[PDB]
Amino acid sequence: DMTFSTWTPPPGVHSQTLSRFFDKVQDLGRDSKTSSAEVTIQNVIKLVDELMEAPGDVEALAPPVRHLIATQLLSNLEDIMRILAKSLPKGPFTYISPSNTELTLMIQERGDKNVTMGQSSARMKLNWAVAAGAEDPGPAVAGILSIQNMTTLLANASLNLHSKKQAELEEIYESSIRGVQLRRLSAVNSIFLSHNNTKELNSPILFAFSHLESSDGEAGRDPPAKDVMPGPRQELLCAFWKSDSDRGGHWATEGCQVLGSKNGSTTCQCSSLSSFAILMAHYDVEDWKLTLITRVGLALSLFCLLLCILTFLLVRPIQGSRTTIHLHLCICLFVGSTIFLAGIENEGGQVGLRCRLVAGLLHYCFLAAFCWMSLEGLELYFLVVRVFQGQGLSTRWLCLIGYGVPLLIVGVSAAIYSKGYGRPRYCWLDFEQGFLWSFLGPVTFIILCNAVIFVTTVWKLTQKARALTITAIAQLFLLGCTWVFGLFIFDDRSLVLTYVFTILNCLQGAFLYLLHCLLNKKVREEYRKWAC
Ligand SMILES: *[C@@H]1O[C@H](CO)[C@@H](O)[C@H](O)[C@H]1NC(C)=O
Numbered sequence: 001d002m003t004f005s006t007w008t009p010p011p012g013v014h015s016q017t018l019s020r021f022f023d024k025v026q027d028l029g030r031d032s033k034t035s036s037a038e039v040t041i042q043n044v045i046k047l048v049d050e051l052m053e054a055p056g057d058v059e060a061l062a063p064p065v066r067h068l069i070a071t072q073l074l075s076n077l078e079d080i081m082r083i084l085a086k087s088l089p090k091g092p093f094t095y096i097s098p099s100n101t102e103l104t105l106m107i108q109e110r111g112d113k114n115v116t117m118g119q120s121s122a123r124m125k126l127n128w129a130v131a132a133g134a135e136d137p138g139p140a141v142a143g144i145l146s147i148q149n150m151t152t153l154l155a156n157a158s159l160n161l162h163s164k165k166q167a168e169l170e171e172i173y174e175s176s177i178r179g180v181q182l183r184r185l186s187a188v189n190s191i192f193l194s195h196n197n198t199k200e201l202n203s204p205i206l207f208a209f210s211h212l213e214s215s216d217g218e219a220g221r222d223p224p225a226k227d228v229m230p231g232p233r234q235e236l237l238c239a240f241w242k243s244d245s246d247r248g249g250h251w252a253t254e255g256c257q258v259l260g261s262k263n264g265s266t267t268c269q270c271s272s273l274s275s276f277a278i279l280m281a282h283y284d285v286e287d288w289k290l291t292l293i294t295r296v297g298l299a300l301s302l303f304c305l306l307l308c309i310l311t312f313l314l315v316r317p318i319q320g321s322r323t324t325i326h327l328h329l330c331i332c333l334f335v336g337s338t339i340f341l342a343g344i345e346n347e348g349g350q351v352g353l354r355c356r357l358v359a360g361l362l363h364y365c366f367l368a369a370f371c372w373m374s375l376e377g378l379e380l381y382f383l384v385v386r387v388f389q390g391q392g393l394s395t396r397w398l399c400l401i402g403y404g405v406p407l408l409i410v411g412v413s414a415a416i417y418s419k420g421y422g423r424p425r426y427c428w429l430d431f432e433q434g435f436l437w438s439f440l441g442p443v444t445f446i447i448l449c450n451a452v453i454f455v456t457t458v459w460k461l462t463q464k465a466r467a468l469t470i471t472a473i474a475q476l477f478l479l480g481c482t483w484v485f486g487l488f489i490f491d492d493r494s495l496v497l498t499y500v501f502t503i504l505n506c507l508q509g510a511f512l513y514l515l516h517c518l519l520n521k522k523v524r525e526e527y528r529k530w531a532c
């Protein structure tokens, strides 16, 4: 037969088990027969099977060395199959190893017929023109090899993501990717033509790769594979093995695309030919998490609001409409901050029911606190207009307005934009599909109402209540500034605006407690009465 290639380890690599494998490869190639060429190919495949079954000291090597060895082994297997392919007559050649390694070969004359080959692991529909070769005048050579336990060699493999592929993935996930963990599905490991120049195809070729299930039952009787449910943080790879100058080799996905997956199969279309395999690759991505600074600041604001609520609940001299409004505004702020601490973080998952509920209650607590501030302004207006006679406004109407107007707004918005609640990064509203206008509508309308109320109250007072109007205006400004800076903490790469948001929460709690409780004299007298 024709001269066989000498199989050598990669330079600088020492391994006794691999040397034992290559010595048998060389001796078999020395003693191979023309009628045993396809036997020689199967024997080489069985030697690969034994090498997998006896990993030895290969795993003790560096991963880049192991990947380089695996690339060399698959390349040599392609070379020896190509060499002995011309030694075989025309026709298909299909063999299954006792270690369940499938190899398909096919020899036909030159032509442009659409040829669909494959038995179990894969189905390759290719144009036969490229199988003949650009310069080879002999019969066309093409084949597919599938080996199941490259995990012996391809452990902790690396995936090189293309720049535009990274840009698309980060647009999909809306932040950076730490890395990729690779879990393959198929045993397909080699697709080759007659000539070695298969780096580019003038026409894409379709493949139907099936993924074997490692069942412990009788072989050949298993049903077709059940489809794996795709998760949020994972997408399906029609990948190939490409050598690398720095780490031996890596997985790559460019030039290939996914078309569908059913009956235990995945349909891929590729612009080139190489070692193809289907990966079920989970992407490791960091999730936006509140910093310790922000958590401590929110805890301090919660403490201040708790002191406020206890004071407004227990100090009996100060009971009134203003105290009721401050009580309920502090309650809404406390509940909103508690929900923010407990559920703004989305721990690297999809937008579930809990995340959507957290976004809904955050919006409700927002609108309720804002409407209770508006109620405080409205009662100041009513007090000034009636020239301080009184009777206020009943707490039942106050609780209807400040807890039902937000309920109506949130219910309507969640009935229209149910998909706009919760994001994969944080449990807060998403402003796509015109949700920004529908969210700023009620907010800007109540801002306009508050501004009208405050300017009318100031105008009426110009013709102790001016101090209350100033305090209400400053409190509204502080709450609005806190919320506005609470919307830009998620976007910013450098969390310097989170410092401002934390400081604004701290100042909001301190402002409420100082102005409404500490600077109050009846509150202090009640405090010393309790502490006596
Ligand atoms: C493949 O063989 C390795 C040992 O070399 C073993 O750890 C692994 O579980 C096997 N996997 C399958 C699917 O046989």
Ligand SMILES: *[C@@H]1O[C@H](CO)[C@@H](O)[C@H](O)[C@H]1NC(C)=O
Pocket: 155, 156, 157, 181, 182
């Ligand atoms: C990746 O390699 C590390 C050792 O660096 C090992 O602890 C870990 O189990 C490996 N994980 C996979 C999926 O190979």
Ligand SMILES: *[C@@H]1O[C@H](CO)[C@@H](O)[C@H](O)[C@H]1NC(C)=O
Pocket: 224, 262, 263
């Ligand atoms: C393959 O699955 C589809 C449903 O996705 C089913 O309609 C079809 O009958 C199945 N065929 C085989 C051979 O399992």
